[PDB]
Amino acid sequence: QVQLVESGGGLVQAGGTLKLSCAASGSGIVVMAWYRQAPGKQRELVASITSGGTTNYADSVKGRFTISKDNAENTLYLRMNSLKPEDTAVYYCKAFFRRDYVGYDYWGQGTQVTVSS
């Protein structure tokens, strides 16, 4: 959480695949998630994964995108299949944790995903 660095974005053809990576600086973690923000739009939830492994997806990305966490690597992933122009946005990862019973959010810098039609 302290530092989250994203990579894996790019410019891809409709129907294409990308894999976003959210590298944590190191290892109270409760949930990690992916969000996206399209031009002039509000930031929306894409997918979440609890420390226990419970996944949740936004209806717009169900089946096409998969969230996973590799604790050995301290990396959160978003595998994106069957990409559509509507998926164009800056994608952000988030880590939520508790320190001395107080909840905190730490966000990544974002990675651009552009899907051309």
Cβ-contact 14, 115 below 8 angstroms: yes
Tokens of 93: 């990862």
Kindly provide the resolution of this structure in angstroms, with one decimal: 1.5
Cβ-contact 80, 19 below 8 angstroms: yes
* Residues with Cβ within 8 Å of residue 40, at least 6 apart in sequence: none
* Residues with Cβ within 8 Å of residue 20, at least 6 apart in sequence: 6, 7, 8, 9, 34, 77, 78, 80, 91, 93, 111, 113
Q: Measured between alpha carbons, how far is residue 92 from residues 66, 100, 117 in Å?
A: 15, 26, 23
User: β-strand 111-116 against 10-13: which pairing, if any?
Assistant: parallel
CA angle 56, 20, 14 (to 5 degrees): 90
DSSP state, 81?
Answer: -
One of 3.40.50.2000, 3.40.50.880, 2.60.40.10, 3.40.50.1980 is the CATH number of 1-117, namely 2.60.40.10
Experimental method: X-ray
CA angle 9, 34, 40 (to 5 degrees): 75
